[PDB]
Design a protein around this motif. Structure first.
Motif, PDB file in Angstrom:
ATOM      1  N   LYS A   1     -15.163  25.384  30.322  1.00 38.57           N
ATOM      2  CA  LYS A   1     -14.015  26.149  29.869  1.00 38.57           C
ATOM      3  C   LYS A   1     -13.377  26.846  31.057  1.00 38.57           C
ATOM      4  CE  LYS A   1     -13.192  24.611  26.919  1.00 38.57           C
ATOM      5  NZ  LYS A   1     -13.763  23.235  27.038  1.00 38.57           N
ATOM      6  N   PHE A   2     -14.078  26.873  32.185  1.00 34.50           N
ATOM      7  CA  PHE A   2     -13.556  27.517  33.382  1.00 34.50           C
ATOM      8  C   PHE A   2     -12.951  26.486  34.320  1.00 34.50           C
ATOM      9  CE2 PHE A   2     -17.310  30.553  32.603  1.00 34.50           C
ATOM     10  CZ  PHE A   2     -16.536  31.378  31.794  1.00 34.50           C
TER      11      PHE A   2
ATOM     12  N   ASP B   1     -10.200  24.528  33.147  1.00 35.95           N
ATOM     13  CA  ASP B   1      -8.857  24.231  32.658  1.00 35.95           C
ATOM     14  C   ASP B   1      -7.809  25.197  33.205  1.00 35.95           C
ATOM     15  OD1 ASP B   1      -9.160  26.564  31.249  1.00 35.95           O
ATOM     16  OD2 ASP B   1      -9.691  25.585  29.368  1.00 35.95           O
TER      17      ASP B   1
ATOM     18  N   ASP C   1      -5.995  27.485  31.438  1.00 34.93           N
ATOM     19  CA  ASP C   1      -5.990  28.805  30.810  1.00 34.93           C
ATOM     20  C   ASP C   1      -7.024  29.770  31.383  1.00 34.93           C
ATOM     21  OD1 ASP C   1      -5.607  30.959  29.148  1.00 34.93           O
ATOM     22  OD2 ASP C   1      -5.796  29.819  27.290  1.00 34.93           O
ATOM     23  N   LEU C   2      -6.608  30.642  32.297  1.00 32.66           N
ATOM     24  CA  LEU C   2      -7.533  31.596  32.909  1.00 32.66           C
ATOM     25  C   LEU C   2      -7.933  32.768  32.016  1.00 32.66           C
ATOM     26  CD1 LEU C   2      -6.054  31.704  36.513  1.00 32.66           C
ATOM     27  CD2 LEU C   2      -7.833  30.218  35.546  1.00 32.66           C
TER      28      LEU C   2
ATOM     29  N   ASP D   1     -10.087  33.061  29.435  1.00 30.68           N
ATOM     30  CA  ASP D   1     -11.528  33.257  29.296  1.00 30.68           C
ATOM     31  C   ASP D   1     -12.229  33.473  30.634  1.00 30.68           C
ATOM     32  OD1 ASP D   1     -11.129  30.633  30.066  1.00 30.68           O
ATOM     33  OD2 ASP D   1     -11.738  29.792  28.131  1.00 30.68           O
ATOM     34  N   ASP D   2     -11.700  32.889  31.711  1.00 32.31           N
ATOM     35  CA  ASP D   2     -12.298  33.087  33.036  1.00 32.31           C
ATOM     36  C   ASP D   2     -12.208  34.569  33.382  1.00 32.31           C
ATOM     37  OD1 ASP D   2     -11.038  30.558  32.650  1.00 32.31           O
ATOM     38  OD2 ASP D   2     -11.584  30.007  34.700  1.00 32.31           O
TER      39      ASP D   2
HETATM   40 CA   LIG Z   1     -10.238  28.666  31.298  1.00 30.54          CA
END
Ligand SMILES: [Ca+2]
Ligand SMILES: [Ca+2]
Lengths: 121, 121
Positions: free
Chosen positions: A80-81, A83, A85-86, A88-89
């Protein structure tokens, strides 16, 4: 590989501004030294793998196939880290800072202390 | 019966801290609602029996005389969750969380979300 621009990073990381007392320019500098702004960066070691802009490891922070026994503090799959879209990172980076501090990234070197205006966009 | 104190539970569960993103206070709250801190608690249903502080069942997690056909995911005898050493109970609780999540204990009720500082010692 998807290397962002310094200005793009500055914009996308707006939410981390002053979090824990860390200014935006400091967060941009940290990102440059951690992954070169590559949001798909993956670095492997003998016992672990680090993911994305913030190089979050699968030993304590996220869970992946290599180590399902990870502490998974951020309660998420490491991919998920990788992609665009930061969101959630950033949520996870806030936890790393809160728990271990900026040295998770800087490793006791003062790389983001002088001429911080150079990281501004 | 061996009912622990909230502070004792807080100490003994130190190892679960932030595991899967679950803070220590949340683990203490879960324990209070699951067994009242009784490490020898045993609750029986028509088809199963739950053991200890974490009320681990003999249908999927551990194996006992009532059901030798249990999935035995934690690969252990249920009576091991009735003693003072929470070491193995913790190892198994980590698996339950990883596999089913906190609802194994909370059952879709938000019992451990507000005023979490009340569970601190
Ligand atoms: Ca992400
Ligand atoms: Ca035990």
């Amino acid at each position: 590989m998807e290397q962002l621009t310094k200005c793009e990073v500055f914009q996308k990381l707006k939410d981390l501004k002053d979090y824990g007392g860390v200014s935006l320019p400091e967060w941009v500098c940290t990102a440059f030294h951690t992954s070169g702004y590559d949001t798909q960066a993956i670095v492997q070691n003998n016992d672990s793998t680090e993911y994305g802009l913030f190089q979050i490891n699968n030993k304590i922070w996220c869970k992946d196939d290599q180590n399902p026994h990870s502490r998974n503090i951020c309660n998420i799959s490491c991919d998920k880290f990788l992609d665009d879209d930061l969101t959630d990172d950033i949520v996870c980076a806030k936890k790393i800072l809160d728990k271990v501090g900026i040295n998770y990234w800087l490793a006791h070197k003062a790389l983001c202390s002088e001429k911080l205006d150079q990281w501004l966009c």
